Amino acid sequence: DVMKRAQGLFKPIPAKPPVMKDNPASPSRVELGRMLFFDPRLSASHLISCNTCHNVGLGGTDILETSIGHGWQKGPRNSPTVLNAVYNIAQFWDGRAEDLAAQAKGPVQASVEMNNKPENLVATLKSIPGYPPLFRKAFPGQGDPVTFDNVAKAIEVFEATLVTPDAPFDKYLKGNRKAISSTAEQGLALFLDKGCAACHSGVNMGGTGYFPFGVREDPGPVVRPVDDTGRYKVTSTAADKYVFRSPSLRNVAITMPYFHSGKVWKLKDAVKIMGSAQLGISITDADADKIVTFLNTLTGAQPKVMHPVLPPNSDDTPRPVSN
Amino acid sequence: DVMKRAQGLFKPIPAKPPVMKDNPASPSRVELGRMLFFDPRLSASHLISCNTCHNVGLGGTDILETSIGHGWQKGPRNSPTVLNAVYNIAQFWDGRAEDLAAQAKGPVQASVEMNNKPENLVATLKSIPGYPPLFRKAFPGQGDPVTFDNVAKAIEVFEATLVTPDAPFDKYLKGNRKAISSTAEQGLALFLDKGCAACHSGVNMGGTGYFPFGVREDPGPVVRPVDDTGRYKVTSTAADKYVFRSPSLRNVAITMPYFHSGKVWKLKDAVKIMGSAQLGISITDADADKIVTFLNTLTGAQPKVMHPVLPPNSDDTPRPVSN
């Protein structure tokens, strides 16, 4: 039976946030991470926060082809969702960061994203009187707790709470056959039988390893821009050219556009391109429609996040830098 | 007694949101307005929402000298707080919009702010399947409820909930003498005795009328940029040159920088400039410090807003425009 086959390849998202080794999630550290995720003072301009590009109301992404950051500069890649990102084997589309705490240091410093630097960020947080007390509560064994590393750890334990349990497919995996429609179940059988679960398996429906984008056919220079060689830039290993981490397909129906280039807006087109590029098949329009109906059952409960009330500047807070 | 004098000039913010005539606040219409306030699809770029420039975590402002909108374009004016704006006599620093619903049509259309147009906004909301149902619930007697006017009305009844009761000064006005410090009470006596309450009175501590910025002395061409003649641009009446609405001073300690130009970062400097420019006095540093201690008692309870979960695009949703 397709339910039993699925139960051998995928797992539901747990209700409880996962534990980060060597980063305990106290109430104070998670609260601090939620404040920092929404605080645009993490950026040089004081205008961009993590929620700008990973909007918790829009599936943890920004619904753009590629992100726009400091100075209205467009980046090379589509912003992947923060939802469930804690269950991926590594972070970024090329897997270059080992975990969420390592990842968070990237956007802060990237000139086309937040355009900040660690020293300015620490000075800024130290100048906001309400922040050092919260760092002391969250990192109480440190003489100097307001550090870049601690910013990254706080944001990690907050992001570990941004999981989306209870999608209809997870209720199916727990044994409720009626939680998805017959057409969704036929999409699930097509997903399994065409081979998609090789690269999109486990608790996260993906995020499990590194694969060429174009195992069987080049997706072409729009969907796969030639200069973006993926993990090759990370490892300098020729076998990594055009290799990317598979994405988690959880919440894919609400995180358009698709692929690391953001050039494919319709989920049905992304499914057909995956069949061609990865599997050398031409998926029919009727089969692609059933697979999309199945992928729509992977949208989980969206987190319900209170927007933080952030502590005010002092007169010594650094002034925004917008150039 | 200074408490009795204050009770004759100011009033505390009511706990209940005020009623908007001809815009009833049903649960559905207020919920819709909260979704729209946080939805960056109100902008051409799909990246800017009202919360970008009126951040509910940062006192309802953006803590910049002047706002930056579409294309990284800097505007001429500092963003005033949305908190308590429902109690001002008119909206914008020049009072050119009669109420919050009229005001909301401005940022949507301004090329240096959201850079949208009404027809594109309506088409975009109609293309997001979850939005027309919510407009029907909020505006049930209309055959075509997804309109620009209705967007503005929904956002108005949401903004009428963004009031900040329970500041320490309001507890003092209700008869608790100990709710503010002796030094704050001395600041209050100085505020009254120097004449500041003529222009900063009532329920909102301001927002009550139109006054020259520079009754007694020109603040100079940095703090009062010469090309920004305030209400003169609205009325073409020469007596309105450099006339601006007085701001509400509620939450002023957390809404820096100050004045419509955003050029004065320190509240103590703004107090001294008000004494010179408006009253022809040189406030001493000790008196300015007591007045700032009093203004700090005007920070009320900050609203606790759940970030909305916004309905996803369809494949017919217009794609972002970033140029």
Ligand code: HEC
């Ligand atoms: C827009 C200008 C961004 C801002 C601000 C932040 N992020 Fe981001 N994020 C962005 C892009 C374009 C990408 C992909 C880049 C690449 O080279 O692959 C990312 C990636 C992430 C991830 C990885 C998720 C995954 O691999 O599945 C995470 C967890 C993430 N971003 C988190 C994050 C945080 C915490 C931020 C504030 C400190 C932040 N991002 C800002 C775009 C932008």
Ligand code: HEC
């Ligand atoms: C491994 C060899 C894969 C197989 C087989 C399939 N997919 Fe895949 N998928 C894979 C990668 C490495 C990526 C990212 C490629 C990139 O550079 O962007 C993807 C991406 C998708 C997406 C887009 C998701 C998103 O952008 O967030 C979808 C919708 C998707 N894959 C679906 C899918 C289906 C339905 C498949 C069977 C027909 C399939 N994939 C096979 C790796 C692999």
Ligand code: HEC
């Ligand atoms: C930044 C790019 C802005 C965006 C996006 C929005 N607003 Fe704004 N707002 C901005 C400025 C610079 C100003 C002052 C302009 C002037 O000419 O005076 C405003 C003003 C307001 C007000 C008036 C408050 C008062 O007079 O006390 C309100 C109520 C307001 N803005 C609300 C608002 C809403 C609801 C928005 C989304 C539709 C919105 N603003 C976007 C800067 C920017």
Ligand code: HEC
């Ligand atoms: C009317 C004649 C006024 C008197 C007397 C005082 N103020 Fe005022 N104030 C007034 C206006 C019209 C404005 C806005 C001017 C502009 O173009 O920007 C202000 C502004 C302030 C501010 C800044 C608040 C903010 O930017 O949100 C403060 C802190 C302020 N006023 C304080 C203040 C004090 C302490 C006064 C007595 C010494 C005083 N004001 C008098 C109009 C008038």
Ligand SMILES: [Ca+2]
């Ligand atoms: Ca995407």
Ligand SMILES: [Ca+2]
């Ligand atoms: Ca201000």
